[PDB]
Amino acid sequence: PFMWRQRAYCAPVPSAFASQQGVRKPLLRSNSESLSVFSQIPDGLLGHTTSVTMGNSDIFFLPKPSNLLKIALPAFVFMPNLTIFTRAFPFYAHTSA
């Protein structure tokens, strides 16, 4: 409230200087209302737009012809075996075989 001619964002809209226009619309409005989203537009369907859901579309199907193959294939180890040497696991986990 100190530099009016230099702070235009906090100033009234040009429709307010015009002296001419159930319930009527307000006569005085600021340009600082531009910094709000739901100032003029309504808040309808505000919290219900993240609730319109659509399911995924991926199908997990692939035929598995093993008759074509006669050799084994390698396979990853995903986790360490804790069913054996459980007590020593923190003590040998840092070593490499």
Binding site: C10, A11, P26, R29, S30, S32, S39, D43
Partner: peptide, 21 residues
């Protein structure tokens, strides 16, 4: 809560424009 916030900001902006005038 959002309604209260909206009306507060509205009134504040109106007061500032009134001070400009």
């Amino acid at each position: 809560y959002a309604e209260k916030q909206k009306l507060f900001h509205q009134e504040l902006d109106r007061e500032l424009a009134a001070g400009h005038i």
